[PDB]
Design a binder for these strands. Structure first.
Ligand SMILES: [Mg+2]
Length: 119
RNA sequence: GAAGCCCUCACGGGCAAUGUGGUGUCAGGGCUACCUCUCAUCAGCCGACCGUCUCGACGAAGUCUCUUGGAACAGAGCGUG
């Protein structure tokens, strides 16, 4: 909400999550805000996911701007538990980072484009 | 970075990426490359002596003489541990 500056259409979110699932199987993904943060910092991040139902918002507030000054692309997900499930967790997750896609580097790269365009 | 914890005989359930658990805590630590090594620390097993306080068992040698007296545990005499 305070860290969310644009709205992601339901359909776009689906493609993104789908991509994430194939990312855990084919490529590599980091689950958890701390682990995600280090990707953006270490630059190993290609696409980071951030839930919008996070409370306290503090836990994620930094993701956006941090990602911006690191060139890393990021997309918003409405449900915290969907991102967790999509990441392959039995629990939810406030943030995830696709650290080098897998059999999705295409669809992924394009999701990043759609978002950049979503302003 | 799920390698973790709680309940339950089990099955099963619950917690946990908003981080369980590993590492680590100024002889600073981590990371990378090395040297040597462990006897530090931490976790868990076992598990007292002595002392002190109280309680209890066992535990030596006269119940002799005369006098006074209601009564000798007194006086005088003899004897014992
Ligand atoms: Mg520890």
């Amino acid at each position: 909400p305070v860290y969310v500056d644009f709205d992601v259409p339901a359909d776009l979110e689906d493609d993104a999550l789908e991509a994430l699932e194939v990312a855990r199987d084919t490529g590599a993904v980091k689950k958890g805000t701390n682990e995600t943060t280090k990707s953006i910092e270490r630059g190993s991040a290609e696409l980071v996911f951030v839930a919008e139902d996070v409370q306290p918002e503090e836990i994620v507030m930094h993701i956006p701007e941090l990602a911006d000054e690191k060139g890393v692309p990021f997309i918003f997900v409405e449900q915290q538990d969907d991102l967790g499930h999509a990441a392959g967790l039995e629990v939810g997750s406030a943030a995830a980072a696709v650290t080098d896609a897998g059999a999705a580097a295409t669809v992924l790269e394009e999701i990043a484009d759609k978002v950049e365009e979503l302003r």
